[PDB]
């Protein structure tokens, strides 16, 4: 019964995002019948997320459109989470409430 | 002190290194070469060694397009270079070549 915490939150959110996509789509997409690209679809997920962090338009030449609309959906969600977190942290630092060594550098990188 | 002329050995080793490691890791590739830094390796890739770069004579259309654009946006080479599909240094040299041979 470990309890979510600041150390574990980013890891937690991405953990349950990988699970969210995995359960949803592999219970949603299927008929591969053997194993359908779970490792691979998730690698497409991390690839897309990096691409959006680098602001590089990400277009895979072949791909099923439900898979693509999938990735674009969840990626936009994680983008909304990350961005909102960034705004909020800059508000906290602006008011000078939080003194942390990491959140300042991270928050900087984000902006 | 590190700066200097590019060598066929350094350039081929740069080909192989870029092939193996990938485009986004420059510090790793600069580690193998001597007398060259990471910035220099990257800009040396994207400026010249990159196979997507077009090395050949300019057709008539490319000269029309280059001249027109250069009269449209004076002195901006990094904006024009992607539009004609050539390297900024290359289209520069070719432009001074067009004014040089034009008179």
């Amino acid at each position: 019964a470990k309890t979510v915490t600041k150390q574990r939150v980013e890891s937690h959110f991405d953990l349950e995002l990988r699970a969210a996509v995995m359960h949803d789509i592999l219970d949603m997409m299927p008929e591969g019948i053997k194993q359908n690209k779970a490792r691979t679809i998730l690698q497409h997920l991390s690839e897309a997320w990096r691409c959006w962090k680098a602001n590089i338009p990400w277009k895979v030449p072949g791909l099923p459109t439900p898979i693509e609309n999938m990735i674009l959906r969840y990626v936009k969600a994680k983008a909304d989470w990350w961005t909102n977190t960034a705004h909020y942290n800059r508000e906290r630092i602006r008011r000078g409430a939080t003194v942390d060594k990491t959140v300042c550098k991270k928050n900087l990188g984000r902006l | 002190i590190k700066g200097g002329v590019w060598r066929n050995t350094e350039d081929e080793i740069l080909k192989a290194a870029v092939m193996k490691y990938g485009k986004n890791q420059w510090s790793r590739i600069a580690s193998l070469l001597h007398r060259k830094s990471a910035k220099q390796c990257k800009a040396r890739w994207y400026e010249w060694l990159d196979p997507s770069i077009k090395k050949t004579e300019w057709s008539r259309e490319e000269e029309e397009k280059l001249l027109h654009l250069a009269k449209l946006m004076p002195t901006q080479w990094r904006t024009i270079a992607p539009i004609i599909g050539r390297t900024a240094a290359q289209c520069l040299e070719h432009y001074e070549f067009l004014l040089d041979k034009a008179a």
Binding site: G32, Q43, H44 | N24, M73
Partner: peptide, 27 residues
């Protein structure tokens, strides 16, 4: 065949307006 998935081999792990002409020639 449709559900062939391109391997996600990882890489980690342009047009112009004609108004520029009117402006530049104007100046």
């Amino acid at each position: 065949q449709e559900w062939k998935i391109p391997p996600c081999i990882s890489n980690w792990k342009v047009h112009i307006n004609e108004n520029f002409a009117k402006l530049a020639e104007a100046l």
